Design an enzyme around this catalytic site. Sequence first.
Site, mmCIF file in Angstrom:
data_model
loop_
_atom_site.group_PDB
_atom_site.id
_atom_site.type_symbol
_atom_site.label_atom_id
_atom_site.label_comp_id
_atom_site.label_asym_id
_atom_site.label_seq_id
_atom_site.Cartn_x
_atom_site.Cartn_y
_atom_site.Cartn_z
ATOM 1 C CD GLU A 1 40.635 43.107 47.604
ATOM 2 O OE1 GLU A 1 41.011 42.896 46.424
ATOM 3 O OE2 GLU A 1 40.420 44.247 48.095
ATOM 4 C CG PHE B 1 34.360 56.713 44.613
ATOM 5 C CD1 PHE B 1 35.168 56.778 43.496
ATOM 6 C CD2 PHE B 1 34.874 56.180 45.781
ATOM 7 C CE1 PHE B 1 36.474 56.304 43.540
ATOM 8 C CE2 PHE B 1 36.167 55.711 45.836
ATOM 9 C CZ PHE B 1 36.975 55.771 44.715
ATOM 10 C CD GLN B 2 35.584 52.709 46.312
ATOM 11 O OE1 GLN B 2 35.073 53.290 47.286
ATOM 12 N NE2 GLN B 2 36.811 52.185 46.339
ATOM 13 C CB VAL C 1 41.935 24.214 37.198
ATOM 14 C CG1 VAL C 1 41.200 23.817 35.929
ATOM 15 C CG2 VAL C 1 41.092 23.916 38.434
ATOM 16 C CG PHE D 1 47.083 17.729 27.799
ATOM 17 C CD1 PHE D 1 48.276 17.064 28.045
ATOM 18 C CD2 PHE D 1 45.997 17.509 28.649
ATOM 19 C CE1 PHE D 1 48.399 16.198 29.116
ATOM 20 C CE2 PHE D 1 46.105 16.639 29.727
ATOM 21 C CZ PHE D 1 47.314 15.982 29.961
HETATM 22 C C1 LIG Z 1 40.611 19.491 35.160
HETATM 23 C C2 LIG Z 1 39.672 18.596 35.917
HETATM 24 C C3 LIG Z 1 39.350 17.328 35.425
HETATM 25 C C4 LIG Z 1 38.476 16.512 36.146
HETATM 26 N N1 LIG Z 1 38.134 15.276 35.697
HETATM 27 C C5 LIG Z 1 37.617 14.405 36.599
HETATM 28 C C6 LIG Z 1 37.607 13.032 36.367
HETATM 29 O O1 LIG Z 1 38.056 12.552 35.295
HETATM 30 N N2 LIG Z 1 37.099 12.210 37.312
HETATM 31 C C7 LIG Z 1 36.595 12.685 38.473
HETATM 32 O O2 LIG Z 1 36.132 11.888 39.331
HETATM 33 N N3 LIG Z 1 36.596 14.017 38.706
HETATM 34 C C8 LIG Z 1 37.097 14.885 37.799
HETATM 35 N N4 LIG Z 1 37.103 16.207 38.049
HETATM 36 C C9 LIG Z 1 36.555 16.724 39.306
HETATM 37 C C10 LIG Z 1 35.034 16.783 39.190
HETATM 38 O O3 LIG Z 1 34.678 18.047 38.649
HETATM 39 C C11 LIG Z 1 34.369 16.703 40.544
HETATM 40 O O4 LIG Z 1 35.004 17.638 41.411
HETATM 41 C C12 LIG Z 1 34.480 15.332 41.182
HETATM 42 O O5 LIG Z 1 34.157 14.357 40.201
HETATM 43 C C13 LIG Z 1 33.445 15.264 42.283
HETATM 44 O O6 LIG Z 1 33.885 14.520 43.398
HETATM 45 P P1 LIG Z 1 32.796 14.345 44.560
HETATM 46 O O7 LIG Z 1 31.498 13.847 43.965
HETATM 47 O O8 LIG Z 1 33.441 13.566 45.670
HETATM 48 O O9 LIG Z 1 32.730 15.919 44.914
HETATM 49 P P2 LIG Z 1 31.885 16.644 46.075
HETATM 50 O O10 LIG Z 1 31.028 17.698 45.425
HETATM 51 O O11 LIG Z 1 32.904 17.029 47.126
HETATM 52 O O12 LIG Z 1 30.947 15.509 46.703
HETATM 53 C C14 LIG Z 1 30.242 15.756 47.916
HETATM 54 C C15 LIG Z 1 28.885 15.061 47.862
HETATM 55 O O13 LIG Z 1 28.689 14.200 48.987
HETATM 56 C C16 LIG Z 1 27.575 14.641 49.771
HETATM 57 N N5 LIG Z 1 27.928 14.513 51.193
HETATM 58 C C17 LIG Z 1 28.768 15.282 51.891
HETATM 59 N N6 LIG Z 1 28.831 14.810 53.158
HETATM 60 C C18 LIG Z 1 28.035 13.730 53.231
HETATM 61 C C19 LIG Z 1 27.701 12.852 54.249
HETATM 62 N N7 LIG Z 1 28.245 13.013 55.476
HETATM 63 N N8 LIG Z 1 26.832 11.841 54.003
HETATM 64 C C20 LIG Z 1 26.301 11.686 52.780
HETATM 65 N N9 LIG Z 1 26.603 12.520 51.775
HETATM 66 C C21 LIG Z 1 27.468 13.545 51.984
HETATM 67 C C22 LIG Z 1 27.314 16.069 49.365
HETATM 68 O O14 LIG Z 1 25.927 16.381 49.494
HETATM 69 C C23 LIG Z 1 27.780 16.094 47.918
HETATM 70 O O15 LIG Z 1 26.747 15.676 47.033
HETATM 71 C C24 LIG Z 1 37.938 16.982 37.353
HETATM 72 C C25 LIG Z 1 38.258 18.248 37.835
HETATM 73 C C26 LIG Z 1 39.131 19.060 37.109
HETATM 74 C C27 LIG Z 1 39.500 20.441 37.602
HETATM 75 C C1 LIG Z 2 41.059 58.044 44.926
HETATM 76 C C2 LIG Z 2 40.117 58.972 44.207
HETATM 77 C C3 LIG Z 2 39.902 60.263 44.677
HETATM 78 C C4 LIG Z 2 39.028 61.114 44.003
HETATM 79 N N1 LIG Z 2 38.812 62.368 44.458
HETATM 80 C C5 LIG Z 2 38.210 63.265 43.648
HETATM 81 C C6 LIG Z 2 38.247 64.623 43.940
HETATM 82 O O1 LIG Z 2 38.831 65.043 44.970
HETATM 83 N N2 LIG Z 2 37.642 65.491 43.105
HETATM 84 C C7 LIG Z 2 37.012 65.066 41.998
HETATM 85 O O2 LIG Z 2 36.466 65.910 41.249
HETATM 86 N N3 LIG Z 2 36.972 63.746 41.702
HETATM 87 C C8 LIG Z 2 37.552 62.829 42.507
HETATM 88 N N4 LIG Z 2 37.514 61.517 42.219
HETATM 89 C C9 LIG Z 2 36.819 61.057 41.008
HETATM 90 C C10 LIG Z 2 35.307 61.034 41.204
HETATM 91 O O3 LIG Z 2 34.945 59.805 41.834
HETATM 92 C C11 LIG Z 2 34.594 61.043 39.868
HETATM 93 O O4 LIG Z 2 35.103 59.953 39.093
HETATM 94 C C12 LIG Z 2 34.831 62.368 39.165
HETATM 95 O O5 LIG Z 2 34.906 63.356 40.184
HETATM 96 C C13 LIG Z 2 33.670 62.725 38.259
HETATM 97 O O6 LIG Z 2 34.114 63.201 36.994
HETATM 98 P P1 LIG Z 2 32.973 63.349 35.870
HETATM 99 O O7 LIG Z 2 31.834 64.112 36.487
HETATM 100 O O8 LIG Z 2 33.611 63.892 34.614
HETATM 101 O O9 LIG Z 2 32.600 61.779 35.704
HETATM 102 P P2 LIG Z 2 31.839 61.117 34.447
HETATM 103 O O10 LIG Z 2 31.036 59.960 34.983
HETATM 104 O O11 LIG Z 2 32.891 60.890 33.386
HETATM 105 O O12 LIG Z 2 30.874 62.294 33.942
HETATM 106 C C14 LIG Z 2 30.175 62.173 32.709
HETATM 107 C C15 LIG Z 2 28.821 62.867 32.814
HETATM 108 O O13 LIG Z 2 28.591 63.748 31.709
HETATM 109 C C16 LIG Z 2 27.513 63.239 30.906
HETATM 110 N N5 LIG Z 2 27.818 63.278 29.451
HETATM 111 C C17 LIG Z 2 28.616 62.451 28.761
HETATM 112 N N6 LIG Z 2 28.620 62.839 27.462
HETATM 113 C C18 LIG Z 2 27.825 63.925 27.353
HETATM 114 C C19 LIG Z 2 27.439 64.753 26.303
HETATM 115 N N7 LIG Z 2 27.891 64.542 25.047
HETATM 116 N N8 LIG Z 2 26.598 65.786 26.535
HETATM 117 C C20 LIG Z 2 26.138 66.017 27.765
HETATM 118 N N9 LIG Z 2 26.491 65.234 28.791
HETATM 119 C C21 LIG Z 2 27.329 64.190 28.612
HETATM 120 C C22 LIG Z 2 27.221 61.825 31.378
HETATM 121 O O14 LIG Z 2 25.814 61.574 31.389
HETATM 122 C C23 LIG Z 2 27.720 61.824 32.801
HETATM 123 O O15 LIG Z 2 26.645 62.233 33.652
HETATM 124 C C24 LIG Z 2 38.361 60.679 42.856
HETATM 125 C C25 LIG Z 2 38.585 59.380 42.394
HETATM 126 C C26 LIG Z 2 39.463 58.533 43.071
HETATM 127 C C27 LIG Z 2 39.710 57.129 42.589
#
Ligand SMILES: Cc1cc2nc3c(=O)[nH]c(=O)nc-3n(C[C@H](O)[C@H](O)[C@H](O)COP(=O)(O)OP(=O)(O)OC[C@H]3O[C@@H](n4cnc5c(N)ncnc54)[C@H](O)[C@@H]3O)c2cc1C
Ligand SMILES: Cc1cc2nc3c(=O)[nH]c(=O)nc-3n(C[C@H](O)[C@H](O)[C@H](O)COP(=O)(O)OP(=O)(O)OC[C@H]3O[C@@H](n4cnc5c(N)ncnc54)[C@H](O)[C@@H]3O)c2cc1C
Lengths: 571, 571, 571
Positions: free
Chosen positions: A49, A111-112, A379, A464
């Site tokens: 992503e 979860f998540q 970069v 470099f």
């Molecule tokens: C590896 C590496 C090395 C680098 N070394 C250098 C280097 O040696 N020299 C260098 O120059 N850069 C270098 N940089 C890039 C540097 O980090 C900056 O990105 C760059 O210097 C900034 O350019 P800028 O001020 O045009 O950027 P920007 O942030 O794009 O500037 C936009 C600015 O203009 C303003 N602005 C936007 N629209 C308007 C508008 N319509 N009217 C008035 N203001 C507006 C904004 O508010 C903002 O402050 C390097 C980058 C990397 C990755």
């Molecule tokens: C795609 C997918 C599908 C899933 N589907 C399922 C499913 O169908 N069924 C399922 O069961 N899971 C499923 N899961 C997993 C689920 O999300 C959980 O991760 C899992 O179910 C929980 O296992 P757990 O309770 O051992 O987790 P943990 O977080 O490992 O549990 C640890 C717990 O025990 C406690 N603990 C640790 N040490 C001690 C200790 N010494 N003494 C006392 N307590 C302690 C901790 O406080 C904590 O509360 C799935 C995961 C994925 C990614």
Amino acid sequence: KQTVAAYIAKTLESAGVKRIWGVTGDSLNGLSDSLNRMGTIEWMSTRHEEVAAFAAGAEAQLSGELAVCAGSCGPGNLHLINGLFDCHRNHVPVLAIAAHIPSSEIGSGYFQETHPQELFRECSHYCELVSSPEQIPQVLAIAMRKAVLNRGVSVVVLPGDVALKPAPEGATMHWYHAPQPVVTPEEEELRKLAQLLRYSSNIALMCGSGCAGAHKELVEFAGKIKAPIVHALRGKEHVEYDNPYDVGMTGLIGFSSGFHTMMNADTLVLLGTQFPYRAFYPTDAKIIQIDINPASIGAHSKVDMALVGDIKSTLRALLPLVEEKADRKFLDKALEDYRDARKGLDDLAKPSEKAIHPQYLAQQISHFAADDAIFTCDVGTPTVWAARYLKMNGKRRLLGSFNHGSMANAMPQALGAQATEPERQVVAMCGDGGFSMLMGDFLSVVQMKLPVKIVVFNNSVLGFVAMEMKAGGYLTDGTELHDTNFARIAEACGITGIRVEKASEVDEALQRAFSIDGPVLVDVVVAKEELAIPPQIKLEQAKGFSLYMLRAIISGRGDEVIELAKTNWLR
Amino acid sequence: KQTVAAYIAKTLESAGVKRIWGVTGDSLNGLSDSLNRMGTIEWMSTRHEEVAAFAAGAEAQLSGELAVCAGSCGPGNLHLINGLFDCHRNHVPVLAIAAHIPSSEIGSGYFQETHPQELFRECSHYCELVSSPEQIPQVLAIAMRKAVLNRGVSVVVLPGDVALKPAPEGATMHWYHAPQPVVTPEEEELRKLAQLLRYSSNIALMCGSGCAGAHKELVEFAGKIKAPIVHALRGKEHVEYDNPYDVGMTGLIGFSSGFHTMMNADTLVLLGTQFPYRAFYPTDAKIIQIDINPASIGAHSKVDMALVGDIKSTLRALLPLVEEKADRKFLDKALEDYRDARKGLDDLAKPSEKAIHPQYLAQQISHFAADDAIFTCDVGTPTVWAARYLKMNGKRRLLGSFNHGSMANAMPQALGAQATEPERQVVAMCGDGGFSMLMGDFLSVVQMKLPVKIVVFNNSVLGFVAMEMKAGGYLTDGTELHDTNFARIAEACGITGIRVEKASEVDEALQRAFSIDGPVLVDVVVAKEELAIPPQIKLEQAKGFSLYMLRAIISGRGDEVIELAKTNWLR
Amino acid sequence: KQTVAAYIAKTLESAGVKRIWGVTGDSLNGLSDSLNRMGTIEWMSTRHEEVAAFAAGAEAQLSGELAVCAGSCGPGNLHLINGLFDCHRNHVPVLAIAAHIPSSEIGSGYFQETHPQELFRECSHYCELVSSPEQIPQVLAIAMRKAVLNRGVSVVVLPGDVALKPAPEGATMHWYHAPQPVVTPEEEELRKLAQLLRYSSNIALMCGSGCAGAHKELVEFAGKIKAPIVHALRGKEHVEYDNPYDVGMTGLIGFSSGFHTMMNADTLVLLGTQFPYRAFYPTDAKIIQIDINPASIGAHSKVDMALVGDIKSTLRALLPLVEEKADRKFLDKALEDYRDARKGLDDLAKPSEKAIHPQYLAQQISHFAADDAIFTCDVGTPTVWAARYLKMNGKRRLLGSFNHGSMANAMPQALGAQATEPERQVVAMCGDGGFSMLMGDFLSVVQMKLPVKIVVFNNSVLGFVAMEMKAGGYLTDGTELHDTNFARIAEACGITGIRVEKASEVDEALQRAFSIDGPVLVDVVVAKEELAIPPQIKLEQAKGFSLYMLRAIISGRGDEVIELAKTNWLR
Ligand SMILES: Cc1cc2nc3c(=O)[nH]c(=O)nc-3n(C[C@H](O)[C@H](O)[C@H](O)COP(=O)(O)OP(=O)(O)OC[C@H]3O[C@@H](n4cnc5c(N)ncnc54)[C@H](O)[C@@H]3O)c2cc1C
Ligand SMILES: Cc1cc2nc3c(=O)[nH]c(=O)nc-3n(C[C@H](O)[C@H](O)[C@H](O)COP(=O)(O)OP(=O)(O)OC[C@H]3O[C@@H](n4cnc5c(N)ncnc54)[C@H](O)[C@@H]3O)c2cc1C
Ligand SMILES: Cc1cc2nc3c(=O)[nH]c(=O)nc-3n(C[C@H](O)[C@H](O)[C@H](O)COP(=O)(O)OP(=O)(O)OC[C@H]3O[C@@H](n4cnc5c(N)ncnc54)[C@H](O)[C@@H]3O)c2cc1C
Ligand SMILES: Cc1ncc(C[n+]2csc(CCOP(=O)(O)OP(=O)(O)O)c2C)c(N)n1
Ligand SMILES: Cc1ncc(C[n+]2csc(CCOP(=O)(O)OP(=O)(O)O)c2C)c(N)n1
Ligand SMILES: Cc1ncc(C[n+]2csc(CCOP(=O)(O)OP(=O)(O)O)c2C)c(N)n1
Ligand SMILES: [Mg+2]
Ligand SMILES: [Mg+2]
Ligand SMILES: [Mg+2]
């Protein structure tokens, strides 16, 4: 009479989004169904992503229009985070739909379970959890508006159950495209600025991406007062073409000329910039900053006069108030210094007996690439080479992770690009560390039929070599990458793979990769180019400074760092 | 060159701050010393830091200039939080200096450890921890600028040890006062709006504080198209004087007229507003919103056309594009409805045999108060009475916690006011709950020699009695305050205390309190005024709606809530 | 005495860390230098930092000892986040060193600025920013201790400049390994529990990972009272071997038996569990929960009696208080039901004419894998198959993202595993979505010489096909992966690639992959197995329920979801 998800999807379509980048989950069923029933917005499935976010960013950067990405609940949307930072820091309009665990389970360590509402605060302008379907109309209205008008990321966190509930019945799905206002400073402020400029002998401009769309006004202004123009990296594509006053860029990866120009200016005028290297700014010059965003003002230098203003409209109004200066001794001296500075840019940029020089590769890329090609650079060293060798012209473009500074941006940004401009040529100048860091999404150029031209700078290393001294006994596990064949990998993924090991083969590989109808990865084995560092500077570094924080630059040749000395341009 | 604290203090002085509100700690020694050695900025010690924040807000609101407050580490600065929310939600420029525990102890659960950098994220535009003195110049530059130009709170978190370290030697302390730009929408957007207005018969305006400074343009516009003007509470002081098109305000505490006016409009135009009651907005009318802040746009209604723009400059440009409408049947019908609606406003606003009616008190306050007096009203009934009875005229002012909605704001805001305008009359319409909630700072009017005129609505209760039915058997511990004598308390604090129990005595107490040279607290015993609620509405409430969320209003009389019915206006 | 970085590294070595997983940056120079000069801790460079986190987690899970990962400033450490969530949710001790931008630039929107101190709050027990080198001793002491003793993630955020400053001179680098205490509930609480159990006829246990190390006590207890044992997924490896009372697991991917067992129990006893599916828990049975962590107690069911306690020591003490029950009608009926329930588990687990059945593959993996092999399974179908077919025995292990529920965990966890137990066989049951999601780190098995055995379930799809109905006209871009050849890719990366398309070839591929000395990726083309859903359940889903939230299960056959019906057991 529809779902909350549908309401969102339809509103988005009205706003004109053409696609949503992400990776499905059950937590997004509502959105999927709606998207499918609607058939208007294309779902761009990526492999990670993080790449969806990066791409959306690139899409927004190129289109200038709102772009969208989405992620399942938990790890789904979390994967967006690094990319969203890049979008946000690059000032591009991106809405991120973060699906969320079922409402009921929230608070129980389900979860998540994550807390997206909280996680994305930093990489966004707006971040809210849609608990009740009743809030979708105002939550979405603000999110979109801010994203678009404040130029950044908005996040809508939406539990899967809520997304399936009925949207408010009275809600409007129509979107009014409200354009930026005209934001110019008051006449009195302008008059002050004009007097100030009129009383200054050596005037200099540092220009950033803020100058986009204002190229005409920019040069005219610089011309009128005979002021040289240095640019920040992100201003490169908007400033360094058709510019009689070009003095290049500075910072570690630029050229000394820009630094000396500012250190010899009475008045330095920052125009839409966020150039971050505080040590490269004059201590005893009047610094005048114009910017559309107050939070930019003085972030990196002192400011003697600050004006809130759109660079275009501000210069339009400022011109009639500024009388033509005839003295151009300062401007001429600067231009001269810059030409003298690009001395040695060519040194290593030529075919070679042994390993292939990165600078050569870059030079050739800029040469054979389309006159309107969209570049991207990882970069790492690709960013250095991209910035020094790619010739801009106001049609071509350059994307990178210049502010957030993330590795592995090149290819994912390239996908975004290509999808937005399927007719256009997109060239990803990738590192081998960066290409492999998100290598899974290489499979996306196939699956998405996106004819990007990947060019890996295969140096088997991270950055470099020898950031101090070439090591014949020491080898940090950190910088060394295991010799890999990416052409071979491209081939096994169903993509044309061209392996290149001899300088003589470069022009051929490039020309062919560009003309082939489809994805091509060009695996070029480049030298482990070193970077010699004066012992004096290594000393400073141990105090807690990077080369970016020092008054130091990489030589035009690109093989060593040298101290920028105080240069007083003769009376 | 000096200490970080000194650097801050001196920069602030250049920006023109006249005082800093707060309460000392060891964690602020650096700032104290500097303030003392400087002798220019006055330290306004309060009794609770919460009041320092509130005051600073009021000072900023009145002055229109940056205002500052500060708190010791831990509980010190934390005490600011509620106030800072009020400052932030009220869109006033306030810098808050939050002293912090010593760097070294951070992360160890030290005495007083909190994490201000995090806590204030929500009530601020900017919140950073100054770890290294090296960052003070850029941190402060941004904080101040954002606070001032984005109109809100900034927070600088500063450990006591860091504050004592030497500020960067090269740092500039001079501040350039950069005014707001001129922000007007593009000519094409304006032309659209004009054509839209031109083809609308029944046009209505809802105006908010965003209309401040634009009164001339506002009425002229309304006059030109014959459009009635409803206002939001915070627009009251800027809109409801000298206004031929005044249709009053709406919402629970306003008058029905405004609601019916919008429900009978073809086109409704929101001008600088954040009126939050979504149910009071037309479902089937074209809603056009103009606002300087994109995040405001569509927060509370749908938007058919949105324009980013300064209300003043926008109307200036819009006028020549809008042809004069002659038909004023709509406008006239509205005005009529509003006059008909203030029917019963007078019902209880007269001297009485038994208890004193709040409405009477308020009417008399507005009558005897200075023609340019600054009012403040506690959240609670004083807000209702203040909004309905205080006659504005474009000189007088009205402060409250209208957005953050905090009790106990009245007096503390009043202190801020009085200190900023020591020549001016300040009248705090306080609740007895609200006055007692931060009663400690009553001692501040003495100690600070601030001649505020406190008027407590002593009803021995929290809010409207019987939010349903007077209870002759039931008595919630929730609403009932133990009978207290505040005049007696005022007396024991060294402040003139006037106790008032008979309606006949009101005019005398007020007249005397206003003319006395100094602090006066007027303890008026008012009735426990009830609020009858239709059983139909009590029903809706149990579903999870407050009276603010329903299509319901308080009667002109003020003693019952009545449902707003759908009303259609002929032709 | 040395640098802060060195201080950290040395302390870690004393605590016994053997390696640190991550990816270098300039922001980590201090740590790099120290690591290099020390030569004791191995730097495991990954291709994406997310994998470093995952690995560290797996290393911690297997070793039971503190494990460490690190990331550069900005995007560097941010890349860890998803992995750290997995570590944290899996209750394993992991310290994460998050390098940070240079102190001075903080607050100015510097290149790469993020706020790690904030970002990781949720995936950690402790998260602090080391501003001053003075705090490293207490910050690190707490972080390590909490991580280790509270069983979770700690984060230390360390700016590159601070890391290079001298550590406090008096600081101790020696670490005392303090083991967990003995935590058993009071005798009176135990006596209550015993009397409770004594008067219950149908007693059932639901066991989770908390039961690890207590297998002997567990079965003895279950045996003494004749109580069947259902387990949660994460308890599988610690519970479902050598267990006369095994009734399997439940939840969507388990078997009905466990559900019916609890719905027919008088008393249900949760032992160290966080089984999250609230609908699978008895409404009308006494639920007794024992857990070491109070936050676990009642997270997912009601609790009639709760006891804080270590499962091992608690059962040790509880046994002498619990008299032997002779009645085992309940236990026997359950066992029977479970055997009857694995009916159809074999249905599809056999060689086939057409496509290869996933269940077959899994069955064969469990068969040919080492008797002490460490398995890992991607979130997705591999988790289902791994849980149903892998036979545990108390030597083998099973890792997954079972709580955080992240795709793509399988391989990265596998790296961690293999590195910790280089003698042991590690088998990654990967999805093709999951393997490709972090495919870059496939290059790490080569570069790290880690002989993991990857087995991709190449189904060209994301999850179960047709979560409702096979679609002969519809095809969501969401679930469909472009046909890929991973064996071919393995080959081009320098790793043995075995492509498998016919069931007959499976046993051979597996046997060979396991015996080969090194990394092998086994690309098995499995069927797009479907999951039929009753129209009744599809209905429930549209209300906002996933299959996990319903009283529903996947059939033993694995090709359809069936409603769990209420079942009453005689006498
Ligand atoms: C590896 C590496 C090395 C680098 N070394 C250098 C280097 O040696 N020299 C260098 O120059 N850069 C270098 N940089 C890039 C540097 O980090 C900056 O990105 C760059 O210097 C900034 O350019 P800028 O001020 O045009 O950027 P920007 O942030 O794009 O500037 C936009 C600015 O203009 C303003 N602005 C936007 N629209 C308007 C508008 N319509 N009217 C008035 N203001 C507006 C904004 O508010 C903002 O402050 C390097 C980058 C990397 C990755
Ligand atoms: C795609 C997918 C599908 C899933 N589907 C399922 C499913 O169908 N069924 C399922 O069961 N899971 C499923 N899961 C997993 C689920 O999300 C959980 O991760 C899992 O179910 C929980 O296992 P757990 O309770 O051992 O987790 P943990 O977080 O490992 O549990 C640890 C717990 O025990 C406690 N603990 C640790 N040490 C001690 C200790 N010494 N003494 C006392 N307590 C302690 C901790 O406080 C904590 O509360 C799935 C995961 C994925 C990614
Ligand atoms: C007890 C209580 C009861 C209340 N009941 C009512 C009630 O019945 N009726 C009622 O109306 N209110 C009521 N309120 C107040 C209500 O909560 C809001 O505070 C108020 O209604 C909104 O006023 P506003 O729109 O002017 O607010 P503000 O927030 O002051 O509005 C400012 C808006 O205008 C914009 N703006 C600012 N400057 C410019 C510019 N130069 N150009 C363009 N746009 C600009 C801003 O972006 C912002 O969106 C009540 C408050 C309390 C405490
Ligand atoms: C996610 C992330 N990790 C680490 C860094 C620090 N970093 C910057 S460039 C670099 C090496 C890049 O290697 P490669 O992609 O091979 O490009 P090269 O410089 O070798 O051309 C690293 C580790 C970073 N910027 N982002
Ligand atoms: C700090 C705080 N607590 C509670 C509320 C909710 N609230 C609003 S008005 C009110 C009663 C205020 O009482 P008082 O100050 O006596 O004013 P009255 O309406 O009685 O004149 C309460 C509790 C609030 N807005 N703020
Ligand atoms: C990062 C992330 N994105 C999305 C999900 C939701 N999700 C769970 S399984 C799955 C499909 C996994 O596909 P694959 O790796 O092919 O496994 P399969 O079920 O196809 O064997 C998805 C998208 C998730 N859990 N994590
Ligand atoms: Mg490289
Ligand atoms: Mg009261
Ligand atoms: Mg798969």
